[PDB]
Ligand binder design. Sequence first.
Ligand SMILES: Nc1ncnc2c1ncn2[C@@H]1O[C@H](COP(=O)(O)OP(=O)(O)OP(=O)(O)O)[C@@H](O)[C@H]1O
Ligand SMILES: [Mg+2]
Lengths: 105, 52, 193, 141, 172, 281, 29, 70, 121, 52, 52
Amino acid sequence: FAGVGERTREGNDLYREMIESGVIKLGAERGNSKCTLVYGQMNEPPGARARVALTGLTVAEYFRDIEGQDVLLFVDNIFRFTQANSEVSALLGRIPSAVGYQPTL
Amino acid sequence: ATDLGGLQERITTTTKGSITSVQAVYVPADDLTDPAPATTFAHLDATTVLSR
Amino acid sequence: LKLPTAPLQLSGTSAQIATLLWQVAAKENQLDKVQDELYQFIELFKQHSELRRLATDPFVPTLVRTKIISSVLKDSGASEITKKLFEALADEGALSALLEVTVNYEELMLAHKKEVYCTVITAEPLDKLERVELTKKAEKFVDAGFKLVMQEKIDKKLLGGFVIEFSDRRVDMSTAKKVEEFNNFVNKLVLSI
Amino acid sequence: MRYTIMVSATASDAAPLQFLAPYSGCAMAEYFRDTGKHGLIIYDDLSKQSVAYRQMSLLLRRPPGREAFPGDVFYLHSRLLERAAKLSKELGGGSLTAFPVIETQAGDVSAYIATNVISITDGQIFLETELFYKGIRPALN
Amino acid sequence: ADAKALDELRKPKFSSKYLIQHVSQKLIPAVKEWEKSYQPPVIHLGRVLSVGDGIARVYGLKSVQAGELVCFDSGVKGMALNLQADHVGVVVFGNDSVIHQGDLVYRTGQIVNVPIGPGTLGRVTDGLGQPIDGKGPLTNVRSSLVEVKAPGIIARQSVREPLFTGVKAVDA
Amino acid sequence: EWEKSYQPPVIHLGRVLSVGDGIARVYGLKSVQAGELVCFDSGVKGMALNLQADHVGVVVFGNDSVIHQGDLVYRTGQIVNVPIGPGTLGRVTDGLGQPIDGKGPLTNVRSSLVEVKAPGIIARQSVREPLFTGVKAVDALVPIGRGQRELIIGDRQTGKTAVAIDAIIHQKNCNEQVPKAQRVYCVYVAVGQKRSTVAQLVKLFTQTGAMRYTIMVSATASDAAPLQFLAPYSGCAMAEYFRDTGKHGLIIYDDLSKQSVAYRQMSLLLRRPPGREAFPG
Amino acid sequence: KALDELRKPKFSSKYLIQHVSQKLIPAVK
Amino acid sequence: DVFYLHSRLLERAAKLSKELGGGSLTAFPVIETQAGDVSAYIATNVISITDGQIFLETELFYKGIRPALN
Amino acid sequence: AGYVSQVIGPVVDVRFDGELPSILSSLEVEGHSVRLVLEVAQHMGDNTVRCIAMDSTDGLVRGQKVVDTGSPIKVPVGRGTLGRIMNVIGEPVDEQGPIDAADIWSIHREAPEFTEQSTEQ
Amino acid sequence: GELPSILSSLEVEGHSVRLVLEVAQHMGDNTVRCIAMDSTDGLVRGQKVVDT
Amino acid sequence: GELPSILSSLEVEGHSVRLVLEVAQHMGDNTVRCIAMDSTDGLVRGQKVVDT
Ligand SMILES: Nc1ncnc2c1ncn2[C@@H]1O[C@H](COP(=O)(O)OP(=O)(O)OP(=O)(O)O)[C@@H](O)[C@H]1O
Ligand SMILES: [Mg+2]
């Protein structure tokens, strides 16, 4: 789970729901869990929210390329990935393209 | 907003005297969402919006 | 008016000052004199902090800077070219342009003498026959009567031969590169035939 | 005002004070959140805090975005509003709940600051102006 | 310019010294005869390079942190926002009419702090925490930073208790 | 014979002044041509775009993360060229003509420029012979001759690639029943597409047998914006080989609307003033 | 190395060449 | 200063006093809009400057109402 | 190794007197309230890179030592990351200790090549 | 030497009409930047400005 | 010396085609900025350009 720019309340709610439903286990039975959360919240700078989806991709690319699995990657709100890269493009002084997005959209 | 507030906050009734202020505001192309009339909406007690 | 033609053409606003300084100094035939004064000024800004304060500090007035540069440069063999140049660079706050005007003046002077600095990287130190047969091979990489200023180097990773470094272009006449491009060609053939 | 603090950076004040007043008020209310009590904070016209920060960024020659807002104008509101939290039992159980106020322009919530704070917060209280003169006060759509 | 031909000017290359020894005895009195038309050079202080519209560019201030409160010689507070290679652009917490080109800027070492605590309850402050209601300074109060980080994912619990607004529409 | 004919040529050097945003500033290269393909020391090529008075602006055909300040740029001596010829049929090449199908290098081929001025007024003639696409809606209602430009315009997922694919497959079907002088050798240019769809499309073209006549130029969505910008020109040069030697060619520039976005990216990163819908003039 | 302060020239004007040519051409005798 | 451009031009149309000769100057500035959009920059500038408006519509112009004064 | 030149919001220019880091490389900042990691965005020329920060740049002094790491942001991967919460730089946020890493992998990577794609839907 | 304060009024000598400038910002090279209360048509570079 | 006039045409020597420039501006340092009537692919920054 790559939560790109998630609210911290909804990220904590998803984490507790994953503990409760059993797909994430805590303590000594952590190895039997089924998900990996990668969390870049809204309170982080745009450089951090622009690369959380890449961190989720890296954790999934290990399971694809080494373990040889069929992985699920939940990029939560891909539009927030877009808007975080738009923000890091505006901070780097690049001229924004059409409606306000980065020229490298 | 800083220039408009620095002008506008001096037109006040204080504990010495009073200034009743009537300020006509040109609204460009009747667009009350334009920022130069929308900044001076919060600076007034009574707004008298004249409509076309 | 009637200034000499510059030996090679250059970029703007720090090299145009050098081209003008070169044309003025060749009109006065003091080309080696003002280069020496430019080097002495590089060392002058190296030595003292109060002198480079007149080039970096933005709070010194123009009057202080032009009067210090006028009063300290009254005499001592500094030409009228260099003294007027430092008045002109102190009047504008452009005393920081010295370090970039001397390198373009050096390139202009290194082009009026028809010379060329080079770097020969050889695997072993050269003999007085291993060198003489090299420069006649190295003089075909200049297009005129340019006399290269030999600069020798050592590098054991070359397996004999030489590499020229003209800072504009590089000729790799080595053997360690020749056995590199040999193996690439022989492996690009056996994958075809 | 036995329980109310007021941080008042008015319109006459300099734009860094209007930019900084929500962070001052939130650092005051985090005393109550962080020591087991409960907080409640209202940022009246957060759309004026964004205007003040736009003024400071455009005068600092920062690269503008749409409506000349800087790139870190989402980060500005998000790093303020995410401090409104419900702390866990080990951190005292305290809480801070925020009520940002955004003034829209004829209901256009597709404006930049309105979309930013709508995406940040946990829900809206819409107050349409057609319901207001219809007698419905509070004009909650 | 190029760098490969400019980094070799750190070496001396003159082979004649008829001007280095000439002005070295001549530099110091020529500097000293305009010493009162100088300003004292700043390293860890700052001097206002320019000012306008509530922004002061400040030469110097070699060790300001980003976001640190700086103070001018008029007592106006600033905040060093963008540290640049040659100056600091600070934002002025008040009128810049009392700030001139050449004024001294003093860093305070503090990122922007506010009065928090039980004593601020019932008080009317400005955006920096200082009281504007005119009933004395804030006592029973400690300072705290305004740019604290929000609590994390693990520092929260789920939002369960209701906060009553008292308005039927929102509470229903 | 390689040993007796071996002179290491005088390689003209250039430092990288500053790299980033897919455009490098290159000191030196004092004799480089405008539009010349240059080669960085990391292996990634580049086109000398803006010859300036003090530096050269090089757009980087690939990822600019492998280039540093102070890297050496070598000039190759000629304008941006792709290998054209009969050795390109069957091959899946990238935006610069380098094969990405993994079947070895392009042999039986010849380099040629990607930016050729189109043939003039007196070089054309009227479009007389038909090109059948095998789509009877098209071949009955919107008939297409040989030498025509036919826009396949539509929305997202309305069947544009399918019309292109059926034209390419129908060319394979007609090429077995016609003589040599009238055979259509197709090129598919996939700009800005997914690499998975280009892989499935190459599977389709080789399992129907149409890859014997097809060249496939793919600058996909992860490829750099100069490569998506240049890949239609590479494909058009590879098909101009068959145009210029008496044969007949078909070319599908699939999603030129993504080439224009790649060019908008390149122009807006060059600080060029945008126009309508932020596109350059 | 204190010469690194003078690395980049800080030009307060664009037409500096005209001012230095007004002062260096009269340096010719 | 494109408002000041037309402002300082159109304020010279004046009816002078009896002390200054009583002469007059009547300005008739002509602004062309684009598809009836009087909400443009220069159109709202000169509309805010001038006293009256003689607004001419295209839809009344092709209804035979000529001069097409709205 | 390198020292901070400009701190303009989340954008930090770092000056390296010797060898520059690559673009997309990670940079740790030495001496800070938290772990501040910069990621290189471009080379500005004059031996200076321009970085985007992964945390708050409040408290950053011009001349703070920035060390090159030689790689992009490397996060822990493996089955030991299952049920754990990582942030962008691979640090544990669920306060359950360290993250059991089979390997550390750079987050920046090219897409799988054309020979490596599968052609079956 | 001795730049005027911001918002201060300056009086330009030699102008036909009384031209009053108001200091808006300090530009930084011992230069203030002013807005003019009357028309600037007729100002010559170097013309003396007396601070009030 | 003796810069060409604006709108005067220039001939680039040693090109693949007849590259005719046409002077559009005077840039200021004996540099004229020209618009090329043909493709500039193949121009080197030393190429002799005669003035017609
Ligand atoms: N002639 C046809 N008959 C039946 N189905 C069709 C036909 N043409 C296309 N389709 C279906 O329509 C879908 C879209 O077709 P196609 O791939 O050509 O769209 P597209 O134009 O490439 O859209 P995009 O470019 O967004 O992928 C395909 O999945 C295909 O299965
Ligand atoms: Mg398609």
